[PDB]
Design a protein around this nucleic acid. Structure first.
Lengths: 62, 184, 132, 57, 41, 313
RNA sequence: ACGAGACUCUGGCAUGCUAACUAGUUACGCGACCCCGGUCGGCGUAACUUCUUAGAGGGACAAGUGGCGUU
């Protein structure tokens, strides 16, 4: 399966044990009406592009 | 006008991975002569991003105690590293750098949320780690060795710009991504 | 952390309450008004106060503010509240009315008015909210 | 700064401004004195923030 | 002892508490509804 | 019979623009103060892009420059500032000649004589100082002065009438005998503090304005309130036309122009591309001044821009 | 009401203020060296207070604009 790019469209809150991962909605670059919730390790603001090694995995909402 | 060490131009290089377009600062407004600036980059949260990656590399180099503060030691190492990358590759070494930041960044990393669930890295987290991995790639190669950091940092930036796997930074990166693949 | 304290807010309140006429939406004049009309013993406090004055004077230019009291009260509460339309909403030409209040007016002096159109009574007594 | 003050005094604002623009649009430090100073040491540590090794047991 | 405040500088200090925000009381004037010029000399 | 239009804006101020002073001599030179310490001597090229380009920043106050005014000569310029200093700007070189020390607080206004001899300064320390051009207090009013701030002081062009007018935050417009240096008459009647007062070129009638927006005309030959003008908003600056029979008032974000003869709104001068649409105050106006001829009026707003206003017909 | 804050000292700013042979600078002159300028913490004095010192002031308040919250 290929490696799909995705756009940080809203940064939701903060997840993890030590508040070590921001939770985020990512607008896909191919299908511009597919927006999934994904956990991100490290600093992220609105509109930065994440590379996903798979798009089938999906984070549980905090 | 003409740029970096008086001899490495800016409008030759292209950032391939659009993921790191804004987080690899090397282009037009981030064209400085030396990788040395007062900056005050590390004051508010993301301003770190608007630091030229050459200056981030320079800063990331001066590590393991004794070297902390010796930025001119590193400015020099980077200058002689780029000479070696040019004469071993025949290329504006800022492209070899940018290719190494693109290749040598991990794209998915494990985290403790049991055993360590896999999450995605921030692009800035990728640039941060990229530069860390290929700086530790240099200093660990160079430690207790006849070779200089000029050679070791160059060899690291070259092997990373290829993805050779002889690169410490590529080998640790695809190890992290292997452990991230595991817990998925 | 930039929250203002009571000694800043209470001052700013009482300053506006007594001297609304001299103040505006310009910090550097409000700052210089506070010098004249009050012994503020500290420049930092003098600015903090002036600064909250300006912030309140913006909130006064909008609708009314809770903990404040000015001379007019305040030309939308004294003057506008004397708003009255052409004819009142109680001047209905056809008043909707059920047969049961017709039954009680019939047992007053008001057996028959002209402007009372009695509806066909409501069928199937079904008004209570289901339990659980 | 001394150049920008020479183009202020002895020629028009026009030449001064397009110079000042070039300097600040490159690096702001050229015409703004970086306010940072070596923050003072406090007791109980070898410097400003850093504290000495705490010893339990 | 906490001393009082007096501007004389004898029983207490001349300087008020830094918290203390003494607001001078506004004297009441009748806002004029008749434009009046008062020439003299 | 006409409406007024933009010919451009004059960019080059960081702090927003205070009392703009025009000159009879040079039609190509406007000199504006600001809420930075700069005072820009402009160059009106009247080009496509910029109507005016700045030449010389008259640098060197501590705090805001309240008022500036040009001599009849056109080679000197004089500004009062909130640090409590009056300068006397050597307008050729761009330095100071002499500087007037004595005022306690913010010197709010300044004006010249016809001679360019006697200088007068309204300040927040509740006084008005009558100077020489050699920094000597000839006379200072404390006996019966304004009991508040002095937001303007103006001179009559009339030589036979040595008269000066002062508005103030005590709600009064006091008229002064320049000779005896004590008040000629009061003008009791106006409610609220005063921002501005101006004297028409004849030197017979003056116009005062404050928060209330009730622009009041007062005759100087015999003190009488002629008529009120409901400006509607807060009057920050008033300016008579040099040749026409027109009064021009900076009324909040807009400028309302009156014909004093036919008491009617001639026009109201406003910015058109209003991008403060969603819950934001538009760029307030605080100063204005007609040119030598009176085709172009310049007006300094709180967004730092000097806006030009041209007669079309 | 105390404590918090305010506060006091301090750090950063003002070619704006008062100033200076126990602090200097820029001019001018004499002099040493280089081939008209250049170097001088070589010497001496006229202006001046930019650097210097330390006093009085001013300066910043989320004050301005834009976003989610009775806004």
């Amino acid at each position: 399966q290929p490696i799909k790019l995705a756009r940080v469209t809203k940064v939701l809150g903060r997840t993890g044990s030590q508040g070590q991962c921001t939770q985020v909605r990512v607008e896909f670059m191919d299908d511009t009406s597919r927006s999934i919730i994904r956990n991100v390790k490290g600093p992220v603001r609105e509109g930065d592009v994440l590379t996903l090694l798979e798009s089938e995995r999906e984070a549980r909402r905090l | 006008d003409i740029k970096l060490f008086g001899k490495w131009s800016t409008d030759d290089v292209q950032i391939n991975d659009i993921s790191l377009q804004d987080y690899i600062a090397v282009k037009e407004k981030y064209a400085k002569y030396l990788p040395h600036s007062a900056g005050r980059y590390a004051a508010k949260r993301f301003r770190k991003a608007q630091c030229p990656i050459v200056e981030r590399l320079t800063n990331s180099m001066m590590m393991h105690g004794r070297n902390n503060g010796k930025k001119l030691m590193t400015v020099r190492i980077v200058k002689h590293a780029f000479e070696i990358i040019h004469l071993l590759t025949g290329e504006n070494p800022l492209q070899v750098l940018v290719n190494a930041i693109i290749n040598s960044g991990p794209r998915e990393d494990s985290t403790r949320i049991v055993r360590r669930q896999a999450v995605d890295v921030s692009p800035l987290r990728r640039v941060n780690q990229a530069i860390w991995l290929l700086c530790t790639g240099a200093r660990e190669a160079a430690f207790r060795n006849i070779k200089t950091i000029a050679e070791c940092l160059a060899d690291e930036l070259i092997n990373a710009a290829k993805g050779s796997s002889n690169s410490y930074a590529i080998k640790k990166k695809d190890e992290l991504e292997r452990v991230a693949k595991s817990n998925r | 952390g930039r929250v203002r304290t009571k000694t800043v807010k209470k001052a700013a309140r009482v300053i506006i309450e007594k001297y609304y006429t001299r103040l505006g939406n310009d910090f550097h004049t409000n700052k210089r008004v506070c010098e004249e009309i009050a012994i503020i013993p500290s420049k930092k406090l003098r600015n903090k106060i002036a600064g909250y004055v300006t912030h309140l004077m913006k909130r006064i230019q909008r609708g009314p503010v809770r903990g404040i009291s000015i001379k007019l009260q305040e030309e939308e509460r004294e003057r506008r509240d004397n708003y009255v339309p052409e004819v009142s909403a109680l001047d209905q030409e056809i008043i909707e009315v059920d047969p049961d209040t017709k039954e009680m007016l019939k047992l007053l002096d008001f057996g028959s008015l002209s402007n009372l159109q009695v509806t066909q009574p409501t069928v199937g007594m079904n008004f209570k909210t289901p339990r659980g | 700064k001394a150049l920008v003050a020479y183009y202020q005094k002895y020629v028009d604002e026009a030449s001064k401004k397009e110079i000042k623009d070039i300097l600040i649009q490159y690096d702001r430090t050229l015409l703004v004195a970086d306010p940072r100073r070596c923050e003072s040491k406090k007791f109980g540590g070898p410097g400003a923030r850093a504290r000495y090794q705490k010893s339990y047991r | 002892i906490m001393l009082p405040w007096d501007p004389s500088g004898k029983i207490g200090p001349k300087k008020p508490l830094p918290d203390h925000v003494s607001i001078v009381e506004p004297k009441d004037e009748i806002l004029p509804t008749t434009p009046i010029s008062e020439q003299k000399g | 019979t006409e409406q007024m239009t933009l010919r451009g804006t004059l960019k080059g101020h960081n702090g927003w623009v205070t009392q703009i002073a025009t000159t009879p001599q040079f039609p190509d030179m406007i000199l504006s103060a600001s809420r930075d310490k700069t005072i820009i001597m402009w160059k009106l090229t009247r080009d496509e892009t910029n109507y005016g380009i700045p030449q010389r920043a008259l640098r060197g106050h501590s705090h805001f420059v309240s008022d500036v005014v040009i001599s009849s000569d056109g080679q000197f310029a004089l500004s009062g500032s909130w640090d409590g200093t009056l300068r006397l700007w050597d307008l050729t070189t761009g330095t100071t000649t002499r500087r007037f020390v004595g005022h306690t607080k913010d010197v709010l206004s300044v004006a010249f004589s016809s001679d360019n001899r006697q200088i007068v300064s309204g300040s927040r320390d509740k006084t008005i100082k009558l100077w020489n051009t050699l920094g000597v207090c000839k006379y200072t009013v404390q006996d019966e002065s304004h009991s508040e701030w002095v937001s303007c002081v103006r001179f009559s062009p009339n030589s036979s009438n040595p008269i000066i007018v002062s508005c103030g935050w005590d709600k009064l417009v006091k008229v002064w005998n320049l000779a005896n240096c004590k008040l000629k008459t009061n003008h009791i009647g106006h409610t609220g503090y005063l921002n501005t007062v101006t004297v028409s070129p004849d030197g017979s009638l003056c116009a005062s304005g404050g928060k209330d927006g009730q622009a009041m005309l007062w005759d100087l030959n015999e003190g009488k309130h002629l008529y009120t003008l409901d400006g509607g908003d807060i009057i920050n600056a008033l300016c008579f036309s040099p040749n026409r029979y027109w009064l021009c008032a900076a009324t909040g974000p807009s400028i309302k122009i009156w014909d004093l003869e036919g008491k009617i709104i001639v026009d109201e001068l406003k910015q058109e591309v209003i991008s403060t649409s969603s819950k934001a105050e538009p760029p307030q106006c605080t100063s204005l001044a007609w040119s030598a001829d009176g085709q172009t009026l310049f007006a300094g707003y709180t967004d730092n821009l000097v806006r030009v206003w041209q007669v079309t017909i």
